[PDB]
Every structure is written in structure tokens, then in C-alpha cells.
Amino acid sequence: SVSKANVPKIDVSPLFGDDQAAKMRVAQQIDAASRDTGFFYAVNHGINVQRLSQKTKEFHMSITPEEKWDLAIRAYNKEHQDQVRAGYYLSIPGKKAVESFCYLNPNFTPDHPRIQAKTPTHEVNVWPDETKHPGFQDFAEQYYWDVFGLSSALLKGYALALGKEENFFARHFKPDDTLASVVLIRYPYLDPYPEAAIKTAADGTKLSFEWHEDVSLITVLYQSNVQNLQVETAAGYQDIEADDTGYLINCGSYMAHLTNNYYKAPIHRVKWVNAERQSLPFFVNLGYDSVIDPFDPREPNGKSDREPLSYGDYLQNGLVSLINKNGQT
């Protein structure tokens, strides 16, 4: 068997309030989890995840092949050269099971200064036809802001955990410019399930997505109640329990950089499971020009021998590297 990973449930509700002592007690729990397996479940987060799941299912199960081409990123549709990040990521029946829809900051409109400048990693979202998907765009944009709010609260907790003032990360995480993305991933049930869509780990475990560290500051994830994730620990890969009432939180490699690996970006992978399910990550990314000076909370003077890295540089390079390592999703 595989051992169960320690993934504590942390009540994050004080991070929305003004009880500073209570916030510190939450920060300590985040610190402990970040130093152990690198994962925890945020509970009492205030988001209606059942409705998120229902609206997402309605979208995934009603979108047609025609609409998928019309929304497709450039990896699938050469006509859409502006769509590197945002849009539809098609399955390939017989070869690739997973499919998804990615969207970015709703404030990236045609008149946004970064859109006008054609700055890398900024795109205007594409949406299906409103008549075919009534309410979907509005729901999805509102969801972005709901999970942005949770993420801002979580970032106050991580800042306090690291010995900083609570706005240390959040001051770089702003509605007008965040590079954060939502991805609505569908993992299908298939009978037969094509072997070409199943990868195999060195230890023999059947996978849908190989080992990686996240390209993010933190990752704020909702998934269906079907166990699939594993995290590498000193004791080997361990199973992360599912919990479709909470958000699974972990650090990405930008956090590891900024903290000199005090909070590591945990290595994790996705087991192959033949089940119809949802994986709905929010990747907490800062602004394109955001730079936090690296530090080390294990060193008396707090100094680090790492060089500052702008978030835009980090992100553009990280997303390409992840595609090169683990394949186009």
C-alpha cells in the first residue's frame, strides 16, 4: 500500500477578520503544514463549492466539438495565435483523456494597458456563446473574484507565517493586474480507457500527470471527491485524501524561491483513475512586474543568496518548461 499523507484541515476563517492573535494561530498551522508535506486543506473558506461544481459540470457536459475548436488555444488551433493561455484545451480521443478551459483576470479587457502593449502572459478571455451557455461567463467571472478573495486571505496567513506583515504578498496580488488563472479541468470516465492516455511512473504507478512542482506562488484547488493526488515526502509518495468541501492549498516554486526553500514547492503527481471528475485549480500569480526580494527565515539576518526574479519572467518561463517536461495539456 501507499501511506496517507499528513494534510491537515485548517480553519482559515480568521484570516478574513480583524482578530490578530487568531490570525497568528492560523499562520502557525500554515507554517507547520508548509514545513511538513507542503499541503493543507483550507476549510471554512466561505465559497460555495457545490455550486461551482454544478455550474462547471453543466459547461463541460454541454459544450460541443464545434465550440471547442472555436475556443481552442493555439496549440490546437493555428488560427488563434493570441491564445497561448486562455481558452479550450481539447482531448484527443484514443490518446489524451483530459480536457479543460482556462481563463485569466476578467480585467484583461481590450483597453487594458498590458493588452494594448501585448505583454507576454496577458490575454483577453474567450467565452462560449451566451445563448448556448446561459449564465456561464458571469458565473465564472464571479468565481474568479470569490477565489481571489480566498487567496488574498491565504496570502495574509503565509505572510504572517514567514514573520512578515500580513500584506507582504497580498500587496502584489491586485485585481487590476494579477496573472492568476482558473482552469476548469474535466477528467473523463472512459470504457475502454486508452493506454496511450495513461502514463507510468518509475515505481509502476499509473498516472494522468507526472511529477512536478507548481508554477505559482500558491495553488488553491477544488477537486471532486475521488482520490488521485500524491505528494513526494522523505517517506516516498503518499496519497492525499480527497475532500470536496475544502480547498487543497500548496506552495509553488515562486514561494520556494522567495523563502530559499524554507517553504518548498512540494513535488506531486496525479494518479490515473477511471472516473468522471473535476479538478479546478486557481493559480495564485502576482503581477507581471512584481518582484519580492528573496529572504531566508532560517537565517539570523534573513538574507538569501538568491537573486530577485520578476513574476512575469518566472511565469512565462515556468509555463513553457512545464509543457516541455510533462506535455501539452
Ligand SMILES: N[C@@H](CCCC(=O)N[C@@H](CS)C(=O)N[C@@H](C(=O)O)C1CC1)C(=O)O
Ligand atoms: N494554462 C494555465 C496553467 C496550467 C499549468 C498546468 O498545466 N498545471 C498542471 C499541474 S499544477 C495542472 O493543472 N494539473 C491539474 C490536474 O491534472 O488535475 C491540477 C492542480 C489541479 C495558465 O495559463 O495559467
Ligand SMILES: [Fe+2]
Ligand atoms: Fe500541480
